[PDB]
Design a binder for these strands. Structure first.
Ligand SMILES: [Mg+2]
Ligand SMILES: [Mg+2]
Ligand SMILES: [Mg+2]
Ligand SMILES: [Mg+2]
Ligand SMILES: [Mg+2]
Ligand SMILES: [Mg+2]
Ligand SMILES: [Mg+2]
Ligand SMILES: [Mg+2]
Ligand SMILES: [Mg+2]
Ligand SMILES: [Mg+2]
Ligand SMILES: [Mg+2]
Ligand SMILES: [Mg+2]
Ligand SMILES: [Mg+2]
Ligand SMILES: [Mg+2]
Ligand SMILES: [Mg+2]
Ligand SMILES: [Mg+2]
Ligand SMILES: [Mg+2]
Ligand SMILES: [Mg+2]
Ligand SMILES: [Mg+2]
Ligand SMILES: [Mg+2]
Ligand SMILES: [Mg+2]
Ligand SMILES: [Mg+2]
Ligand SMILES: [Mg+2]
Ligand SMILES: [Mg+2]
Ligand SMILES: [Mg+2]
Ligand SMILES: [Mg+2]
Ligand SMILES: [Mg+2]
Ligand SMILES: [Mg+2]
Ligand SMILES: [Mg+2]
Ligand SMILES: [Mg+2]
Ligand SMILES: [Mg+2]
Ligand SMILES: [Mg+2]
Ligand SMILES: [Mg+2]
Ligand SMILES: [Mg+2]
Ligand SMILES: [Mg+2]
Ligand SMILES: [Mg+2]
Ligand SMILES: [Mg+2]
Ligand SMILES: [Mg+2]
Ligand SMILES: [Mg+2]
Ligand SMILES: [Mg+2]
Ligand SMILES: [Mg+2]
Ligand SMILES: [Mg+2]
Ligand SMILES: [Mg+2]
Ligand SMILES: [Mg+2]
Ligand SMILES: [Mg+2]
Ligand SMILES: [Mg+2]
Ligand SMILES: [Mg+2]
Ligand SMILES: [Mg+2]
Ligand SMILES: [Mg+2]
Ligand SMILES: [Mg+2]
Ligand SMILES: [Mg+2]
Ligand SMILES: [Mg+2]
Ligand SMILES: [Mg+2]
Ligand SMILES: [Mg+2]
Ligand SMILES: [Mg+2]
Ligand SMILES: [Mg+2]
Ligand SMILES: [Mg+2]
Ligand SMILES: [Mg+2]
Ligand SMILES: [Mg+2]
Ligand SMILES: [Mg+2]
Ligand SMILES: [Mg+2]
Ligand SMILES: [Mg+2]
Ligand SMILES: [Mg+2]
Ligand SMILES: [Mg+2]
Ligand SMILES: [Mg+2]
Ligand SMILES: [Mg+2]
Ligand SMILES: [Mg+2]
Ligand SMILES: [Mg+2]
Ligand SMILES: [Mg+2]
Ligand SMILES: [Mg+2]
Ligand SMILES: [Mg+2]
Ligand SMILES: [Mg+2]
Ligand SMILES: [Mg+2]
Ligand SMILES: [Mg+2]
Ligand SMILES: [Mg+2]
Ligand SMILES: [Mg+2]
Ligand SMILES: [Mg+2]
Ligand SMILES: [Mg+2]
Ligand SMILES: [Mg+2]
Ligand SMILES: [Mg+2]
Ligand SMILES: [Mg+2]
Ligand SMILES: [Mg+2]
Ligand SMILES: [Mg+2]
Lengths: 205, 260, 127
RNA sequence: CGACUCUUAGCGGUGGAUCACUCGGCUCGUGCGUCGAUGAAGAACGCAGCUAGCUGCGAGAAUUAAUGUGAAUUGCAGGACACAUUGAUCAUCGACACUUCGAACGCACUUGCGGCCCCGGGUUCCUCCCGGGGCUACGCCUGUCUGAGCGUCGCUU
RNA sequence: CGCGACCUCAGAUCAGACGUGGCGACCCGCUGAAUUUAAGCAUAUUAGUCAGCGGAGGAAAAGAAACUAACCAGGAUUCCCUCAGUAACGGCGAGUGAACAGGGAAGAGCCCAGCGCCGAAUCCCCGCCCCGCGGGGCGCGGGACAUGUGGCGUACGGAAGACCCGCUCCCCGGCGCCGCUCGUGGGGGGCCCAAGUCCUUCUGAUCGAGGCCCAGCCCGUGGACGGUGUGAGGCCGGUAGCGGCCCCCGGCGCGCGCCCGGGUCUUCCCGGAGUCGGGUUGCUUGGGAAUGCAGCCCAAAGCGGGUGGUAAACUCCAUCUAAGGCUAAAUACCGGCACGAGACCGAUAGUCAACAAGUACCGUAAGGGAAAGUUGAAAAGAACUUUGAAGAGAGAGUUCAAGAGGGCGUGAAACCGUUAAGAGGUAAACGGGUGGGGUCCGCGCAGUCCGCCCGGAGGAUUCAACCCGGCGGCGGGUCCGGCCGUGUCGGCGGCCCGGCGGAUCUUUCCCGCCCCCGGGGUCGGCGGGGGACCGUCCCCCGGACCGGCGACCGGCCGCCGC
RNA sequence: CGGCUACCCACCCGACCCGUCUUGAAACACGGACCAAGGAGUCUAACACGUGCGCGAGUCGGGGGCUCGCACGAAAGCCGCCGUGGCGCAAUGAAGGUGAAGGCCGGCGCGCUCGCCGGCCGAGGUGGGAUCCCGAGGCCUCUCCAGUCCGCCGAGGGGCACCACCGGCCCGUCUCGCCCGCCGCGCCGGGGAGGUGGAGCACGAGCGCACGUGUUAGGACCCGAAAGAUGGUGAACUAUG
RNA sequence: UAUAGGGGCGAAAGACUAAUCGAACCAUCUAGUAGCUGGUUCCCUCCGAAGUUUCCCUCAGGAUAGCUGGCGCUCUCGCCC
RNA sequence: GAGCCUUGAAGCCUAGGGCGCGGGCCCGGGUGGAGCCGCCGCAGGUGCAGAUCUUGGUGGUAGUAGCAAAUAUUCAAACGAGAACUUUGAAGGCCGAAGUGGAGAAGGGUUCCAUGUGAACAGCAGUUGAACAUGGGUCAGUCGGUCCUGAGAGAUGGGCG
């Protein structure tokens, strides 16, 4: 069966594939369905924005992706308590509540708190009666626009630091050599055996 | 086909029962019993290696070539000798790249549209399309496609205001927006050079939409105009400029045929 | 040009609905235009036909200025029969000849209450 | 010379290819997403003035009523042609009605053999008497009624 | 011995209600091969699929971690692209084959057992009124469930109780009614522009030609159909936030029913067992020192248990809380119900079925399973005569055609009959070469060539040679008149009343904060706003350069028609 | 009168019936009575190479989103603070990991088989090598001076692609060696010089689309078996109660 | 009336089991498999073979070289050696 | 292509005229009755002699083999267009009571019977028939099913799955 200098082929076709072929032909029809679903959602809600719940600021979890930042799921009830608002009241306001999320980072804690304070600033709500506990005048001409697009406060906004200019100094360019990583790596590899030999030297009395 | 021609059940007879080794239907009385079963060379068998609904129908083209072809078709629409060599009637028509006022795109009645085309002298071209809208030749008359009808002028506009309602049912005509162009409308049949009629705001918006060679396109993000291969290309001018004819050998024109 | 997504350009479906439409649609199909003086008088282009009109033929083998009365309407054959239009067989028996009602000009109607109502609906819709 | 045979061609016959047509298929997609003990799917039998199929119907059987429609169905007679009554035909169909088998249900299936309750006639009545109607399948749930137990226990002989 | 109370129970044609059977395209639970591949064949693969069985709905299933990860951490489920033909499995052969990170589509969370607090504060059945329709739901008395445990408060994100502070005093269902409302809610019917105007063909015309400087007429209608053919206007319909009537439906306003949450502090409460797990054996998985599942046996814990991917011990850390349950979305759909389209087939094709198709028919049965479209515009289907016993025929007639006569459009070949020509002992047929004849074509048959120039015989016209007048165009020049074009500077002019770019800068600035000692201090950091600097395109005049298909005028050269 | 013709006939010579398996076919080898219609290298995935196009150290929207509900619109167009991702730009190790710059001059340490310092250039060199450049001299009607202009050049210069070789550099191992570094002085790192294994570097050429050919998996050029499995229907003939 | 397919029944012939039996019939897996026969459809132009090496549970087959074709590419010619 | 056509397209035939080396084509003539082609691109289920090919049709063989198991017919008449076969008469025969007779079970389903036709079917023919068409015919307390159990088959209770 093989031939001249050609690559080894192992295609996965021995299984009777021609029976179970699901084929994209209804793909434009699904795109039109999902457009009509989104426009129906926009007309069926009210003043409430599309993609209504706000989403947090969240960093990926892999030595590969931790530089980036991602629109997460919810606001990690510690953060939502620091916002000073009750749990299901946040679900009614449009603030996403995800109780499994934990906060080790004070930085991302405070960043989520700032995002909560900005959302509570941008919030314009309408009670039924004339009590108007939270509201005002003709509220910015029905806030001049009904519905928003693609995240409420544009949840990505990947922040970019400058580190513009600085004069090179000493110590650094005499110190920060290649050998630091290798010495630290060997220190981390041999952290345990040195302690074991310390215990041996204590035992030998 | 997508379904069996193997609805019949079948077996062979073998080396005995002289006739053949094709599978045969098994039965009696009904005079299909003993005919040719599934296969190619038989009556009421499957076609050979039959068509399947997962054939690779659609094809992808690069977006830069999709824009390059639009630029090439619009550039071919500017020259008068190209578009007459497709088959339009531009003999008594004013300028090539026609550009009417923005009063056109607010029309509501089609009699003003016919009046506009008659005064712009493309009505001779519409009269050709009226002259040639014959019946289709072939087997295609059965499947819902009966009128051969040639393509006329395409009106290009922006900011839709009711020009579609006006120009819509003049036959053979094409009505087509600026920000959504078509190669299938700007070059029907794969030949370059379809006659076109523009509008003021459209014809101003073109240079915003594709740029010059000096500045980039503003509406389309990463796209520049294409590179240009020969800068000046009148080959007769180049060969009869003195810089070449200084450095030519000689016209050698003696024939020197066969000597007996 | 067709803009509904719920009506057919399809030749097969149109011929099938045509040759199998029931009688109360075959009435609308077998429709005749009115003469131009009567359309001036009534402001209506066309009408369904019935048993009792006064009918002139515009085209065929039997043409022109012969205003006769219809007698039968085969909606099964899409054919009306006119009283003057005859032909003998071989055996000397006369028989009516088939005329499709598109080739038919109505000169007088039969007036009736439902025809007055249909005529008033036509005039009110043409407005 | 004729007969026979062969080859062409004209004509004629057998034959049903090509072409043209298409109330038919196949594929793709949208919208919807509905059977049954209140007797389904399926099957049998029956029904028209002339009637075998197909189709449509069920002892009200080529459809009943009602709503819309507005003068026909049709191969031939007739019959209602009435419409200043209710108005032919056709469609829609929401009110009626829906033979026997069929999960089939009174027990089985040979259209057989029953059993109660009730109503009309019988001997003016029970005792294996005519007609009609109703009820009479299995399993299981909630409650009622009846009662078995040297199961546990009381009060009593 | 009797009676009573339960507890276990049976019976009934008890009162009322429910399940069965089907279709199975998609889904769910189990069971389950073999052809084949490996060139042989045992594991492997075919595949946990075909077949079998039981279930279900418009979707189902899944699902709010006994999770992923190991760093600045994510966060229910579902589906797509990637991960990836990779890590891994494998007579380490053939072959098999994931997942988390990432980006999208959709966005949703909850309840109960336990624990304790509330005097069973709870539910079902029967009976009477209550009320209003198209039709059934709250309240009052007596029969039961139930203390071996109804209901309220309650869920691992903590919860409860009791102080203290701070406010807030509610919402869902039913009914009448106004405009509504994203195609302009959904369904049902009926209707809505303009020529059959003129000659002309023809069997019939929807053929062809024509309509003033208003283009014959309508066009938000020129899709498509039928009608004696090939139609925008003769007809249905198509177009349109076109109009009218009829039905039902989703978002405003009177009645009935229900109605204290938050924060701090103190005390108290805090969980699912023959279950996890271990041994062993089978199946499956890529899961390898056993991923998952199941049988048997052994079988717990409370700073516990599980997970952290090479078995086991010691150790530290991270993460989750299993053995109870519910839930839309995105998603699959060859059955069905209608529906719209097609670079698809055109009656030996396309479903087997364009037609009385799962019909005729074969087999006892499981089951197998066809052939078969076309007259003509209109039946106008051949009256009548005349042979024959009738079939059949000859006249006549229908129509454009019987050269269309009831399986009837067009009618090929094999084959057969007859006529016309030619031929005949080496079977017929063929190739090369000719000859004879025949059908037919062309040619005009000893009269067939034409086109130009030049020299001769006629008339009839008016160029031309020459100029005048006029238009248009060629070709060049002062780049004149200006124009635009190419380069280089000047004015930065529009920099703030300019576009955009820049991980240039400007803490001498402005807002939210943080730091040090209510304020100040550059003491520094981040998010947000302006503006100095470079990089390109918008103007100005000035000068450089070229008149290039960038085009107009003047004068010049040289044509031109009138 | 001329005429080739798929008309027919005459005559001379040549002349075995086609298709395929085969060393060998007219074969006493097989298939073919005759005629009409149907009838066989298709499609997808994957790979390799050649070709055409666009962009270019990038490239690709194939998955989504954006536009008013319009036949052709299941089209086309746009996104870029949708580049996440694929392929490539960097290989090598089993892995822990590591990861491609040298040349020329001046000086110093014993210029010692040796390291350091200072300046400049920058992918080394050798032999061929299309092309290009320079050029002795050579030639154009009286004798002097002239310029473009003309063309051949012996020879010489820099040298593309590519070929051949040497030298250099990275990674794995092996051998021989001494020196330096110090988030902490250690069975710690870093380094040198040789000979080797590598799918390497030594100024990058890919990516996307389409077409062609070939190979593989798929019913795969078409038809063909004796078999095997699953699930059902038959004792009306026959066998025996 | 009973016995049903690797099953039944057999005074035993491997006989019979619906004209089939040394494993019945029908449908599906199924277009199963085949190194083995048969066929494999338009013209013209150009070039044009091999039946040999090695290895294979290979000896009617394949891989490998060799033979062939296509696609080119890099140079050489034209003006006493 | 201001393509071609009811003043005749597609297809078919053609001892007609030609072109190309061919694949094939163009025109003439006749049938034929409503659609057809050239070119530039594009996409295919794209070109027949065969496959004991499939389906449909027709030949040679051929007016041939063959219409022969069971002895057998003949005359006259009738109805009729038509008589070797139909019917009647007469004569001669066979079956010879274990039948070529008279009736039933299973099976068949209208074939039973009358009238009318003789187109196809009866393998010659036919005035005939079991062919076709029209219209008729099957009457039960005491004949049988129904009822009984037999060889057996099958349900609930139970068990297994
Ligand atoms: Mg090979
Ligand atoms: Mg492999
Ligand atoms: Mg397979
Ligand atoms: Mg199949
Ligand atoms: Mg099949
Ligand atoms: Mg078929
Ligand atoms: Mg055709
Ligand atoms: Mg269709
Ligand atoms: Mg003939
Ligand atoms: Mg036929
Ligand atoms: Mg009625
Ligand atoms: Mg029963
Ligand atoms: Mg009763
Ligand atoms: Mg094999
Ligand atoms: Mg084997
Ligand atoms: Mg498996
Ligand atoms: Mg199955
Ligand atoms: Mg069920
Ligand atoms: Mg359902
Ligand atoms: Mg939880
Ligand atoms: Mg990859
Ligand atoms: Mg597997
Ligand atoms: Mg028409
Ligand atoms: Mg029409
Ligand atoms: Mg109209
Ligand atoms: Mg396994
Ligand atoms: Mg724990
Ligand atoms: Mg533990
Ligand atoms: Mg633990
Ligand atoms: Mg749970
Ligand atoms: Mg659960
Ligand atoms: Mg769902
Ligand atoms: Mg046909
Ligand atoms: Mg068929
Ligand atoms: Mg007709
Ligand atoms: Mg004719
Ligand atoms: Mg005909
Ligand atoms: Mg005919
Ligand atoms: Mg003769
Ligand atoms: Mg062989
Ligand atoms: Mg041999
Ligand atoms: Mg041969
Ligand atoms: Mg042979
Ligand atoms: Mg033979
Ligand atoms: Mg063919
Ligand atoms: Mg390539
Ligand atoms: Mg990336
Ligand atoms: Mg086997
Ligand atoms: Mg078996
Ligand atoms: Mg079995
Ligand atoms: Mg028997
Ligand atoms: Mg077997
Ligand atoms: Mg047998
Ligand atoms: Mg095959
Ligand atoms: Mg087979
Ligand atoms: Mg060999
Ligand atoms: Mg070669
Ligand atoms: Mg016709
Ligand atoms: Mg042609
Ligand atoms: Mg042709
Ligand atoms: Mg095709
Ligand atoms: Mg084919
Ligand atoms: Mg053939
Ligand atoms: Mg052949
Ligand atoms: Mg054959
Ligand atoms: Mg045959
Ligand atoms: Mg024969
Ligand atoms: Mg003989
Ligand atoms: Mg004989
Ligand atoms: Mg005999
Ligand atoms: Mg007589
Ligand atoms: Mg006689
Ligand atoms: Mg006899
Ligand atoms: Mg005897
Ligand atoms: Mg007898
Ligand atoms: Mg006979
Ligand atoms: Mg008789
Ligand atoms: Mg009889
Ligand atoms: Mg009969
Ligand atoms: Mg009696
Ligand atoms: Mg008796
Ligand atoms: Mg049983
Ligand atoms: Mg049981």
């Amino acid at each position: 069966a093989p031939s001249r200098n050609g690559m080894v082929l192992k295609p996965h076709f021995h299984k009777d594939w021609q029976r179970r072929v699901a084929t994209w032909f209804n793909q434009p029809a699904r795109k039109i369905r999902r457009r009509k679903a989104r426009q129906a959602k926009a007309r069926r809600i009210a003043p409430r924005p599309a993609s209504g719940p706000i989403r947090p600021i969240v960093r990926c979890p892999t030595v590969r992706y931790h530089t980036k930042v991602r629109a997460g799921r919810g606001f990690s009830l510690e953060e939502l308590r620091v916002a000073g608002i009750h749990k299901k009241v946040a679900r009614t306001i449009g603030i996403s509540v995800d109780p499994r999320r934990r906060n080790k980072s004070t930085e991302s804690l405070q960043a989520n708190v700032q995002r909560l304070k900005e959302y509570r600033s941008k919030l314009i709500l309408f009670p039924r009666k004339p009590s108007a506990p939270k509201k005002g005048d003709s509220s910015a001409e029905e806030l001049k626009l009904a519905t928003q697009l693609t995240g409420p406060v544009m949840p990505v906004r990947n922040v970019y630091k400058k580190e513009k200019a600085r004069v090179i100094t000493e110590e650094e360019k005499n110190f920060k050599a290649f050998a630091s990583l290798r010495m630290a790596r060997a220190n981390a590899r041999l952290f345990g055996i040195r302690a074991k030999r310390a215990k041996e030297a204590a035992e030998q009395d | 086909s997508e379904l069996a021609g193997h609805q019949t059940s079948a077996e062979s007879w073998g080396t005995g029962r002289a006739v053949a080794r094709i599978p045969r239907v098994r039965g009696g009385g009904t005079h299909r019993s003993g005919q040719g079963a599934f296969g190619n060379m038989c009556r009421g068998g499957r076609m050979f290696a039959p068509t399947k609904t997962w054939r690779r129908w659609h094809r992808r083209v690069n977006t830069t070539q999709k824009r390059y072809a639009i630029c090439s078709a619009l550039a071919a629409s500017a020259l008068p000798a190209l578009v007459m060599s497709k088959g339009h009637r531009i003999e008594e028509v004013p300028e090539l790249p026609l550009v009417v006022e923005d009063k056109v795109e607010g029309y509501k009645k089609t009699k003003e549209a016919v009046l506009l085309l008659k005064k712009l002298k493309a009505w001779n071209d519409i009269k050709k399309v009226y002259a040639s809208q014959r019946m289709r030749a072939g087997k295609g008359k059965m499947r819902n496609r009966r009128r051969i009808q040639r393509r006329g002028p395409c009106i290009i506009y922006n900011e839709d205001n009711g020009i579609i309602k006006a120009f819509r049912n003049i036959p053979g005509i094409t009505l087509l927006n600026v920000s959504k162009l078509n190669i299938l409308k700007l070059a029907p049949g794969g030949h370059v050079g379809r006659f076109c009629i523009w509008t003021e705001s459209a014809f101003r918006k073109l240079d915003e939409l594709y740029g010059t060679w000096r500045k980039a396109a503003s509406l389309k993000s990463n796209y520049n105009l294409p590179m240009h291969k020969m800068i000046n290309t009148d080959l007769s001018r180049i060969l009869k400029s003195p810089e070449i004819q200084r450095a030519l050998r000689a016209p050698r024109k003696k024939i020197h045929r066969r000597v007996l | 040009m067709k803009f509904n997504p719920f009506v057919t350009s399809d030749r097969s479906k149109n011929r099938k609905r045509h040759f199998n439409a029931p009688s109360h649609i075959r009435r609308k199909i077998m429709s005749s235009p009115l003469s131009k003086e009567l359309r001036q008088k009534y402001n209506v282009r066309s009408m369904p036909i019935r048993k009792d009109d006064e009918v002139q033929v515009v085209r065929g083998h039997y043409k022109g200025q012969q205003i006769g009365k219809v007698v039968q309407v085969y909606r099964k054959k899409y054919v009306i029969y006119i009283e003057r239009v005859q032909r003998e067989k071989a055996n000397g028996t006369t028989v009516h000849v088939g005329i499709h009602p598109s080739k038919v000009v109505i000169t007088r109607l039969k007036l009736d209450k439902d025809r007055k109502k249909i005529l008033e609906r036509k005039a009110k819709s043409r407005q």
